[PDB]
Structures are given as structure tokens and as C-alpha cells.
Design a protein around this ligand. Structure first.
Ligand SMILES: Nc1ncnc2c1ncn2[C@@H]1O[C@H](COP(=O)(O)OP(=O)(O)O)[C@@H](O)[C@H]1O
Ligand SMILES: Nc1ncnc2c1ncn2[C@@H]1O[C@H](COP(=O)(O)OP(=O)(O)O)[C@@H](O)[C@H]1O
Ligand SMILES: [Mg+2]
Ligand SMILES: [Mg+2]
Lengths: 739, 371, 7, 139
């Protein structure tokens, strides 16, 4: 086909995912002579091939003549490292790479320059997609949403913030600063530390900006979804539960808190467990003074704030409660016990009532009411589930009162929504907390694939081409593996019912049901305990050991009624006020939260932003191939290029096509009538190329073939010109030697 | 949707929804007909009363039980009980909700066939299943492994289950039951010159049995002591305020469970059938059947039956092996709670016998699919 | 029943 | 070549001999070929020269008799115009662009050579009539 001497090729390499190569001698039809500093290289039953250098650095990654992982990686690399352009496009999908030191680029003059004009005309930027949302809302009168996704620390929150600053500056009427000032609260309650960075955000946060009929900004409304609350009770090594607990413990030396009798961070069972009481970047006692300012400036009264902190310390002290077993059947609390005593005195509820209700459970039918002892295991489950329920209701209550501080009672014609959510993820131990995140990204990228397919089908209507050239990958067979009536989340929640349940038996029940009944579920070769799911991004392996103990929530209604009974301070009844819901396991409350989130996004036509983290070590403004490839695969950008490469990825206006190729093609032809012959002259068949009404559609490689033959021809022209002017100039040198 | 779970003892209907914590309806499974002349023209008239109606009016009524020893003995009474259960008591249309039904381990197959036919033809429940009660008691008590002694109003049966395998040769059935403690109780109360000779009156006897019976921790001692002098003797109020006074005798009925020689039953007491059941079992399992004894069903509710069992089976077992008895205070319900758990397991959804599959298969399907 | 007992 | 041609070419060759040995350098051979009407490429020049190495190209000397077969071998408008029309479509060419391509593409020349050939051919806009420039440089 084509592989020829002085062509360039990309070679796979262990150190950096691809390396530049030059092809030293032409190919002929199993082994190649290459230069890199010399190696011969080999083929097994062909290497990837490299775009012409003038296209490298081009603005939209779809534009490239050859579309493959090496080219996308390089075009990002050079554009970030040399040119210092972070924002990039693939199709409709913006791609963003955090410069990780600040830049002029976000200033107001750039906001103005991005206002009012097509995002395809201007250079790619977050302002460009924000402006397209702002336009499409008024063009259609359909609400618009923005979806921001990546690894922890990729710049999701800062991308959201700049979209907010854009809306504020375009519309100009304050809501903006209250929205910004909400962030320290939502971090402190909602962010966590993980083995791969601090300040991961373990929930998904949606800001609704609402508009006047003339699209001026009236007010802002906040929602949250997919919160992850196993982290309250349970933490893996070098993890932390939510920051607020550490900030609180750090407070304890200060007189206002003092009556809570907080310990140090190691003291309490919940903060103890992860093993990282101190964090290297943040002075943790210092941070909350910012939280308490943010509460004050956002309309949470000093009356409420101490009630919050009293509830959190309540949770910690509850957690430190210790159970003495009697028997297989029964357990008890030791006769006088300090971490329950202080707990009750914080909350007010009578110690002797809680000591009974923690340890036993009621069950009654109208004739007869019965009280059972429960084992130490179920008592510990109950205690932890109660902690998770208090925490979830506190989170909801704080979000509600922030909403009350953001809302204005003014009426809303449409809204734009800006959404920040953890990206698809893989770590080299995976456990139910991470399995949920991966399943949520399955749904969001169902929506993504169905939308991008629909827009290409519409573009092929707008400029007439048959549908059949389009066909697309769909991830419904995987969601049916996770979410349907015998899916992993269903067999998991079943064993929470089962009389004796354990990871050893749940794994087995999966294998029996799934293992040869599917092609997406596969057993990791050397283990019974793990199982592997072939997500759209990757094969991912999960360890069953975590799931059942994290999975389980049941709060015994007595312990809530006993908390509601408090008269000491009024917040605590106020949380519960607003059943079948109490029985629901975490897996089920997650499925139903994601079904809400999809009910909210399916109402709306999304735009997308993706953020990728250059490097593990937080080095400024430099890039490591070996992460980036993984990130770009986890964004689905690589399946986006692979699908487009299967199609007609490069679009050309007839006018730019004329401009570039006129130097190739002859004056005898004179501008679609020219192309009608010239394209068949140059290229064997229409299968390579479509004529659309105002555009041309090429199968990927062909544009490089054009550029190559154009450059060869122009070199021939320039060579002949030089040699002609040399001939007479040498006749001048002859006349000078005569002189 | 959520299945219905409905349990027919001889002695109660217990019904409610799958995944509910405790049954939504309990009432005695008893049908009463008026026997006397109705005088008052324009007063209400009914051809039958069911449950707490027949309770409220019993003096005027012949009360009869449709179920004798877990066998449904005439079907229109039963049909009328189920009708009252779904429509009046639970207010649920059965067509919308599948149903789960409960049976003693050895009773005739015709019971299952008729119980199926009435469910599909009369109510058109979407799907049905039938479960052996002793299987359900393990679900209720959170165990995979145990021997269950389960004793109802009409039947007592043993089923050993090791690690999810029932073991059918092991399985034993006695007809000592609450009803046939009561039918003895009347006859010995005659020794004190009280007589209770009609079914409405007989239920008063059963209220005596429920309130004042207890099990002798050892029987010859108290039979000597109370006869010598009685502190123990205690006295009960009939519905008209007559006080009647019962001495040694209140233990003598529970003892029939341990000595069917009184009633003239061939068999040995429940302790010796429990031991002979484990002796039928393979010696490998027996160590764990001895530890997980589960008591089930209301006839077990008599105070001290737990400790009388723990004591008396220990004498039969070898000393090296050790005996533990489990009698949670809710055990009367447990056969229903186990059905609440079983009906909600996601794997169970394949288990069910479905209107299409019945309509093709004939009601004999319940033997083939259900067990 | 049908034989050995009344039901 | 006839006797008259051989005499004129030998005389011209001897005029380019700056050492008196009746020889020119390999590196001057191309200059002599162009002065004698040939327009060989550097590849063609090296080929008739025998693809000389830098050292012999700059210092090895050959007389006319060895050059002559090479001149013969080298010896053995509308395309040229279209080639110039490449850089046009008003019939002009930027002086800056022609300078850039001649000094940066192909067998790159020095800025002084390009200035020399381009002197006087561009107008006030900085446009070159390429048909006229081509006729001029072919004369
Ligand atoms: N566009 C940007 N310009 C400058 N700094 C950035 C940018 N994006 C990210 N950063 C830096 O990287 C950090 C991590 O991103 P952030 O959004 O705070 O975390 P997350 O993405 O998990 O919410 C930011 O706090 C900031 O220090
Ligand atoms: N609290 C009690 N103490 C003693 N006997 C009881 C008690 N409750 C019920 N019974 C007796 O047990 C029988 C009912 O038990 P139950 O488990 O409802 O039977 P079934 O499950 O067959 O309906 C009746 O004979 C009743 O007299
Ligand atoms: Mg964030
Ligand atoms: Mg029973």
C-alpha cells in the first residue's frame, strides 16, 4: 500500500507509549529497517503511520488525516508543551488539560471575544462551549447542560468556576459570588482523601443557573447526587473519611467546641481507621475558619452551625461505642460506658433508653409486640447504618439551606446546568465504592454515545448522505449486566437478605449465574474472590471482599424515634422530619439516585468537557504519556477517534479545498464542478469521498495522500526553478571571470 | 410488584406482603354458621362469619375448622377464608400480586393440587409456590444448618437441613398438636368438675391452655409436690365471671407432648423423635444438627419447653457431643417471616409457577416444579 | 386424612 | 558535439581553470555546465561527476577531456510556466514568498543568490510578473 523510505512511523515502546520513527528503506511484501539510533523491527500476523507535520498542532483532534492513539497523544503533547494551549476539541467534546499554573487566558477581554460568535470559528476554550450553551438555549428554548468529568484533581471544579464567571460576565446581574462561596462547605462535607490524591470529591454536584425570558440571570439552585457514604464508617489504608471530621477534631482545643469533648484525630474509631490523621498540604485546624466563614456568608446562622458540629461529634462518639458480646444470640453494652454517655449528653436523649434500643430491636404485630436480642455483628451493622443515615440527612439539610440562600422567589423561563462528577476510574485494587463510580459513568456514556450518534445522523440529513455509513457502539449490554434484575447489584443486594452471606458465596453465585452466560463478565484467571467486568474503557477487576459489609444499610426505626424524641436542641428533630426506604441497601439508594440524575439530564441536550491530569507528582505544566493514554481511554476519546476513523472523519469546505488543491490542479478546470472530475482523477473511487452540499467527506488517510503528492509536486517545481535561475546566474559568473 | 405471602396453619391465617417485617393480618382460621332461629325481621343476616367475626359472636355459632392436621378437609370453607383474606382483610386484588403458600411436609398431594387449582381458577394470581414450613423456619432464624422441630395447631414435624440440603428420609411427622392438647385438657378438667362441651366453649379452654399451661422441668417431682400442698394452684375467669381454679393439672397437658401414652398415641414424645431423626442422619452432619436445634411454631410457646428439651435430649445424646436449643421469642411467626424472606430473594423469581405454565401443564405441575 | 386419621 | 563545438567548449573550460593545470574542480563542473547552457540538478551533477565526496568535490581537479562525457550525459515551457503559476491568481508572485521558497525549500540557495535573481522584477506591491521573469531567466 504505502510504506516507503523517508516516511515516518510511530513505534510502540515500553518507556513512553509511542516513539517517533523514520523508515530508512522502503517496505516490500516481515521486517523493516528503521531509524530513531538504528533498529530493525518486525511484524506479526502493521505499524501506525504519522500525519504530515503541518497538520500536527491542528486545532481539532478529529481534523487529523490519520486518527489513532499515537497521533492524538502527540497532537495533545506538542500543543500543550510547546504552544501552551490547554483547551482542545474532539468533535463536539472539548478536552482540557490543567496547566497547573495560572494563565492570562481567563480574563474579561477573552470573555468578550468569545461572546456572540461560533465556537468553531474561535479557538477552543471552556468559554466557547459555555457560549454555545447560552446560544442554543435561546435558539431552541430547551434547557442546556454541561458535564465535566475526569480524574480527581483534573480541574473539574475550576472548569465549573470559569463557566460560572462566563455566565456572570455575559448576563450581568450577587448570585455569582454566593455560588462560588458555597464551594468550601460542599468540599468540607463532601470531599475526601484517597490513595491517589487528596481532595477527591465523592459526590456529584449540579448547579442550575436560571434565566429571565430575556436570559438575564435571576438566581441559582443546587442539587447533589450519588453521594458515597460507606466512607463514613469504612476506609481503606491511607484513606480518610470526609474532611469535616478532621477539621472538627482539629478544633477541639478551642473553647466553643470544648463541651463536645472531642479527642485527637486518632482517638475515634472513624477517624482512626484509615491511618492518616495528618495531611501534607493543608493546615487542617486552619481550614475550617474558612468553612465557618462560608457558612456565615451563605446564611446559615450561628444557631445552626454549632448544632451541626454537635451532630458530627455525636457521630464520632457514637462510633466509639464498644459492644460486649454475651452469646451467639445476644450482646450488651458494658454497664457504665463513656463513649455512649457523652454521646447521649451531647444529643440529650436518655442514656438508659439508647442503651436498650442500640442493643435490641423491636418487632410487632397488632396483637403482639416482641423484643429480640441481636448479635454483636448485627448491632455493629445497625450502629454504622445509623451513622450513615444521620450523615446523609445532615448533608441533605445543609444543601437545602444553601439552596434557600441562593434562591430568589422570581420565576424561571429556562436554566443552564453545570455538572461536576467523578470520571471513570481504575485503580489496582477496586471495591464497591469504585464499582459504583464506574457504573455511573456507564450511564453517562450511554447518553453520550446516543447523543453523538444522533447528531451525526442529523448532520447527514442536513447535508445528504445515507445513514448506513453510520453505525455506533452501544453500552446497553453492560448496563444490563450491572443494573438488570439479575445483575451484579441485584445478586449483591440479595445476599444482604440471605441467612448466611459472605464474599466467598456471593462470588460463587455470580460465577454460576453470569460466568458462561455473558461475554462482558469474565473470571480473573488466578482467583475465585475477584471478578472482571469489560467496561467500555477497559477490563476492570473488582475484589469481592469489600462489598457485602459496605453494601449493608438498615436503620432500626426505634433508634430514629429515640433520636427524634430529643428536646435539648431543635436541629436534630428538624433533620428527620421531611418506612420502606430504611430497608434499602446502599446499592439500591445509589441506583435510585442515578435514575434521578438520568431523569434530570435526559430532559436536556448536554454539552461535554473532559479534564485529564498530566502527571502523578503534581509537577507544573509538564506531561507524562503513560497516564495520559489511560485518561484519554477512560474519557472514551479513543473510541471516539476509532469510530470516526471507521467513518469519514475529515470534513472539508469546498472553498478551503479549492484553495489548498488549486496549486495541484490545472487551470483547464474551473467550485464543485472542478472537483467532479479532479477527485476521480486523483482518487480511485467515491467510496473514498462524498460530496455533500457545501462540504466534502474523506476516509481518513486520503488527505495525507493529497498532502504528500502536493508536496512532492511543489518540490519538483521549486527544484526546477532554482536550477533555471542557477543556469543564468552561472552565465553571469562566466561574464565576471571574463571581467 | 411484591408477592403476597399467606400461611395456613390449622390454627391461624397469617398473611401480609413480601418484605414486610411481621404479618399484616392474623385471625383464627375458623368459619361459623348461625344455628339458632333468627327472630328479629330486619336485623342483619349472614350465611357465614369468618375470623374475628366468628370470634366476636361465637356463642350463637357452630364453629368449625376447615383444616385438620394440615389437611384442608372441605374446600368451600377454605375458599371463603382465602376470599376474606385477600379482599376483606388485606384489601388487595390477587390478580395484581403473586402469592406464596405453605404446607406441612407429608400431607397428601391432593392438597397441593386443589390448593393450586383454586388459586389459578378462582383468583387468577399471576404465580404461586408452595413451601415446606421447616424449610422456612431456617430462613427466619438466619441459619443454613439445623434440625427444626415445628409444631402447629394441627401437625408436628421434624425436618433436618444441613447446609441447604434437606434430607427427606430423615423426616418424621406426629399429630400431637395444640388442638389435641386442648381435646385432652377438657377431659382432664372434668376431673375437677368443669365441663366444656361445645366448640364455642372449647375455645375458652384453648384460652385457658394459652394463659396458664407450663412445662414441668421434671414431672414426677411437681406431681408429688403440688398434690401434697399447692401454692402453685391458680385460678381463671370464665367470660361470665365464674372463677375456676386449676392446680397440678395445668402442667399435665404440656406433658402430653413428651408422653403420648396419656392420649394413647403410639409414638414417642417430641424429644425421642428429635433424637431418632438425628440418628437417621449421617454421622458426619450430626455434630452440627445437635447444636442448631430450632424450635418453631406456637405449640412450642409453653414456658419451659425449651429447657425441658435441652435437658431431656442431653440424656439421649453422648456426653461428648453438646446440645444447644434456639427458641427466639418471636418463633410463632417465624414460619411466616421465613416466607417473607424467601419470596423477596431475586433468585426466587425463577422459582414461581406461572399462569401460562400452569395453563399448559395441568395442576400436577406443583409436584414437578415446586417441591 | 383418608385412613389412619379423621382428616 | 562537432569540432567547432568541442573547441568552443574546451576554450570555455580552460577559461574556468584558475590553477593553470587545464582542469577545473568538480565543484566548478556544475557552474561550467550552466555557463555552457545545461541545467542539471545537483543529483544529476553529482551523477555525471560520479557522486563525488565533499573532499574530492572541493579539491580534486579534472581536465576538459574527462568533463566532456559528463557534459554530453547532462545534455542527454508550459510546465515551467505552470510551475511559476503555482506561486501566483492575478499573474503575480510575492517577492517575500519567492525568496522564502528559494532559500528554504528544495536545494536551498543563499539569500544573495536569490536577491541577485530577484533584483528589478518585483513591483511596488511586491509582485512579480512570472511570465516575464521566466522569459527573462530563460534567455
Ligand atoms: N485551569 C486551571 N488553571 C490553573 N490551575 C488549575 C486549573 N485546573 C486545575 N488547576 C489546579 O489543579 C487543582 C485541582 O483541580 P480541582 O478542580 O481543585 O480538583 P477537582 O478537579 O478534583 O475538583 C486546582 O485546585 C488548581 O490548583
Ligand atoms: N402464647 C401461647 N402459648 C401457648 N400456646 C399457644 C400460644 N399461642 C398459640 N398457642 C397454641 O398453638 C396453636 C396455634 O399455633 P400456630 O403456630 O398459630 O399454629 P399454626 O402455625 O398451625 O397456625 C393453638 O393450638 C394455640 O392454642
Ligand atoms: Mg472538585
Ligand atoms: Mg405453624
Amino acid at each position: 500500500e504505502l510504506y516507503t523510505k523517508y516516511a515516518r512511523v510511530w513505534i510502540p515502546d515500553p518507556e513512553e507509549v509511542w516513539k517517533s520513527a523514520e523508515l530508512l528503506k522502503d517496505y516490500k511484501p516481515k521486517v523493516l529497517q528503521l531509524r530513531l539510533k538504528d533498529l530493525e523491527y518486525c511484524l506479526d500476523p502493521l505499524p501506525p503511520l504519522r500525519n504530515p507535520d503541518i497538520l500536527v498542532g491542528e486545532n481539532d483532534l478529529t481534523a487529523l488525516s490519520y486518527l489513532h492513539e499515537p497521533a492524538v497523544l502527540h497532537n495533545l503533547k506538542v500543543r500543550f508543551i510547546d504552544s501552551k494551549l490547554i483547551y482542545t476539541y474532539c468533535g463536539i467534546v472539548l478536552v482540557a488539560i490543567n496547566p497547573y499554573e495560572q494563565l492570562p487566558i481567563y480574563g474579561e477581554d477573552i470573555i468578550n471575544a468569545y461572546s456572540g460568535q461560533n465556537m468553531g470559528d474561535m479557538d477552543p476554550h471552556i468559554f466557547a462551549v459555555a457560549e454555545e450553551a447560552y446560544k442554543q438555549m435561546a435558539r431552541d428554548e430547551r434547557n442546556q447542560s454541561i458535564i465535566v468529568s475526569g480524574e480527581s484533581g483534573a480541574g473539574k471544579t475550576v472548569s465549573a468556576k470559569y463557566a460560572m464567571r462566563y455566565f456572570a460576565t455575559v448576563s450581568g446581574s450577587n448570585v455569582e459570588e454566593k455560588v462560588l462561596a458555597s464551594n468550601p462547605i460542599m468540599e468540607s462535607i463532601g470531599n475526601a482523601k484517597t490513595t491517589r490524591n487528596d481532595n477527591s470529591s465523592r459526590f456529584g454536584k449540579y448547579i442550575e443557573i436560571g434565566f429571565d425570558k430575556r436570559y438575564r440571570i435571576i438566581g441559582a439552585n443546587m442539587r447533589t447526587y450519588l453521594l458515597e457514604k460507606s466512607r463514613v464508617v469504612f476506609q481503606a489504608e491511607e484513606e480518610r473519611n470526609y474532611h469535616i471530621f478532621y477539621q472538627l477534631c482539629a478544633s477541639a482545643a478551642l473553647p466553643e467546641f470544648k463541651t463536645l469533648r472531642l479527642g485527637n484525630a486518632n482517638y475515634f474509631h472513624y477517624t482512626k481507621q484509615g491511618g492518616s490523621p495528618v495531611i501534607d498540604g493543608i493546615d487542617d485546624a486552619k481550614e475550617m475558619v474558612n468553612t465557618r466563614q462560608a457558612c456565615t456568608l451563605l446564611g446559615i446562622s450561628d444557631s445552626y452551625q454549632m448544632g451541626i458540629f454537635r451532630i458530627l461529634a455525636g457521630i464520632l462518639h457514637l462510633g466509639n461505642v464498644e459492644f460486649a458480646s454475651r452469646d451467639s444470640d445476644s450482646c450488651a453494652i458494658p454497664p457504665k460506658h463513656d463513649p455512649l454517655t457523652i454521646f447521649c449528653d451531647l444529643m440529650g436523649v436518655d442514656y438508659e433508653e439508647m442503651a436498650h434500643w442500640l442493643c435490641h430491636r423491636k418487632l410487632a404485630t397488632a396483637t403482639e409486640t416482641y423484643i429480640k436480642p441481636i448479635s454483636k455483628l448485627h448491632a455493629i451493622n445497625a450502629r454504622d447504618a445509623l451513622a450513615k443515615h444521620i450523615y446523609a440527612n445532615l448533608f441533605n439539610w445543609i444543601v437545602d439551606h444553601v439552596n434557600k440562600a441562593l434562591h430568589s422567589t422570581v420565576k424561571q423561563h429556562s436554566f443552564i446546568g453545570v455538572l461536576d462528577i467523578y470520571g471513570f476510574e481504575t485503580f489496582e485494587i477496586n471495591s464497591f465504592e469504585q464499582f459504583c463510580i464506574n457504573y455511573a459513568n456507564e450511564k453517562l456514556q450511554q447518553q453520550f454515545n446516543m447523543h453523538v450518534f444522533k447528531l451525526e445522523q442529523e448532520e447527514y440529513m442536513k447535508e445528504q448522505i445515507p445513514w448506513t455509513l453510520i453505525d455506533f457502539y452501544d453500552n446497553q449490554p453492560c448496563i444490563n449486566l450491572i443494573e438488570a434484575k439479575m445483575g451484579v447489584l441485584d445478586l449483591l443486594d440479595e445476599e444482604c437478605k440471605m441467612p448466611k452471606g459472605s464474599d466467598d458465596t456471593w462470588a460463587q453465585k455470580l460465577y454460576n449465574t453470569h460466568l458462561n452466560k455473558c461475554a462482558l463478565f469474565e473470571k480473573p484467571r488466578l482467583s475465585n474472590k475477584a471478578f472482571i467486568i469489560k467496561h467500555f474503557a477497559d477490563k476492570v477487576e473488582y475484589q469481592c471482599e469489600g462489598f457485602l459489609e459496605k453494601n449493608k444499610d438498615t436503620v432500626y426505626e426505634e433508634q430514629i424515634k429515640v433520636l427524634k424524641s430529643s428536646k435539648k436542641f431543635k436541629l436534630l428533630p428538624e433533620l428527620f422530619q421531611d418506612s420502606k426506604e430504611h430497608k434499602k441497601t446502599v446499592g439500591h439508594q445509589f441506583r435510585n439516585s442515578l435514575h434521578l440524575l438520568m431523569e434530570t439530564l435526559n430532559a436536556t441536550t448536554p454539552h461535554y468537557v473532559r479534564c485529564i491530569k498530566p502527571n502523578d507528582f503534581k509537577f507544573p505544566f509538564t506531561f507524562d504519556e503513560k497516564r495520559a493514554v489511560q485518561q484519554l481511554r477512560a474519557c472514551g476519546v479513543l473510541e471516539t477517534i476509532r469510530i470516526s476513523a471507521a467513518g469519514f472523519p475529515s470534513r472539508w469546505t469546498y472553498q478551503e479545498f479549492f484553495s489548498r488543491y488549486r496549486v495541484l490542479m490545472k487551470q483547464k478546470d474551473v467550485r464543485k464542478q472542478t472537483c467532479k472530475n479532479v477527485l476521480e482523477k486523483l482518487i480511485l473511487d467515491k467510496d473514498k469521498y462524498q460530496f455533500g452540499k457545501t462540504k466534502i467527506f474523506f476516509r481518513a488517510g486520503q488527505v495525507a495522500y493529497l498532502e504528500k503528492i502536493r508536496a512532492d509536486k511543489l518540490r519538483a517545481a521549486c527544484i526546477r526553478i532554482q536550477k533555471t535561475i542557477r543556469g543564468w546566474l552561472m552565465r553571469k559568473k562566466y561574464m565576471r571571470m571574463r571581467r | 410488584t411484591t408477592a403476597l405471602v399467606c400461611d395456613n396453619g390449622s390454627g391461624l391465617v397469617k398473611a401480609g406482603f413480601a418484605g414486610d417485617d411481621a404479618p399484616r393480618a392474623v385471625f383464627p382460621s375458623i368459619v361459623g354458621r348461625p344455628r339458632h332461629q333468627g327472630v328479629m325481621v330486619g336485623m342483619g343476616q349472614k350465611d357465614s362469619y369468618v375470623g374475628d367475626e366468628a370470634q366476636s359472636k361465637r356463642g350463637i355459632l357452630t364453629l368449625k375448622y376447615p383444616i385438620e392436621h394440615g389437611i384442608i378437609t372441605n374446600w368451600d370453607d377454605m375458599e371463603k377464608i382465602w376470599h376474606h383474606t385477600f379482599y376483606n382483610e388485606l384489601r388487595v386484588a390477587p390478580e395484581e400480586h403473586p402469592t406464596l403458600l405453605t404446607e406441612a411436609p407429608l400431607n397428601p398431594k391432593a392438597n397441593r393440587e386443589k390448593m393450586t387449582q383454586i388459586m389459578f381458577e378462582t383468583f387468577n394470581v399471576p404465580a404461586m409456590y408452595v413451601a415446606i414450613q421447616a424449610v422456612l423456619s431456617l430462613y427466619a432464624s438466619g441459619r443454613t444448618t439445623g434440625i427444626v422441630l415445628d409444631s402447629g395447631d394441627g401437625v408436628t414435624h421434624n425436618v433436618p437441613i444441613y447446609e441447604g440440603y434437606a434430607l427427606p428420609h430423615a423426616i418424621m411427622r406426629l399429630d400431637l398438636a395444640g388442638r389435641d392438647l386442648t381435646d385432652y385438657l377438657m377431659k382432664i378438667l372434668t376431673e375437677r368438675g368443669y365441663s366444656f362441651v361445645t366448640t364455642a366453649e372449647r375455645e375458652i379452654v384453648r384460652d385457658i391452655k394459652e394463659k396458664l399451661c407450663y412445662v414441668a422441668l421434671d414431672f414426677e417431682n411437681e406431681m408429688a409436690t403440688a398434690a401434697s400442698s399447692s401454692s402453685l394452684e391458680k385460678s381463671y375467669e370464665l367470660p361470665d365471671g365464674q372463677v375456676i381454679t386449676i392446680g397440678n393439672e395445668r402442667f399435665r397437658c404440656p406433658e402430653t407432648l413428651f408422653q403420648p401414652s396419656f392420649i394413647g398415641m403410639e409414638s414417642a414424645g417430641i424429644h425421642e423423635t428429635t433424637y431418632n431423626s438425628i440418628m437417621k442422619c449421617d454421622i458426619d452432619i450430626r455434630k452440627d444438627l445437635y447444636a442448631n436445634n430450632v424450635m418453631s411454631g406456637g405449640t412450642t410457646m409453653y414456658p419451659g419447653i425449651a429447657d425441658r428439651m435441652q435437658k431431656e435430649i442431653t440424656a439421649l445424646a453422648p456426653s461428648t457431643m453438646k446440645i444447644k436449643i434456639i427458641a427466639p421469642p418471636e418463633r410463632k411467626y417465624s414460619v411466616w417471616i421465613g416466607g417473607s424472606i424467601l419470596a423477596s430473594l431475586s433468585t426466587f423469581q425463577q422459582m414461581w409457577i406461572t399462569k401460562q405454565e400452569y395453563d399448559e401443564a395441568g395442576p400436577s405441575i406443583v409436584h414437578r416444579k415446586c417441591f | 386424612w383418608x385412613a389412619x386419621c379423621p382428616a | 558535439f562537432n569540432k567547432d563545438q568541442l573547441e568552443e567548449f574546451k576554450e570555455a573550460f580552460e577559461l574556468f581553470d584558475r590553477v593553470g593545470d587545464g582542469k577545473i574542480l568538480y565543484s566548478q563542473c556544475g557552474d561550467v555546465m550552466r555557463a555552457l547552457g545545461q541545467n542539471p540538478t545537483n543529483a544529476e551533477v553529482l551523477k555525471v561527476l560520479g557522486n563525488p565526496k565533499s573532499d574530492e568535490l572541493k579539491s580534486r581537479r579534472v581536465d576538459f577531456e574527462t568533463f566532456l562525457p559528463m557534459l554530453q550525459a547532462v545534455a542527454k515551457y508550459e510546465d515551467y510556466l505552470e510551475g511559476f503559476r503555482v506561486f501566483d491568481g492575478n499573474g503575480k508572485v510575492m517577492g517575500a514568498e519567492l525568496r522564502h521558497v528559494l532559500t528554504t525549500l528544495g536545494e536551498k540557495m543563499t539569500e544573495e543568490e536569490v536577491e541577485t535573481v530577484l533584483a528589478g522584477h518585483e513591483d511596488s506591491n511586491g509582485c512579480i510578473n512570472y511570465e516575464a521573469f521566466l522569459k527573462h531567466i530563460l534567455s
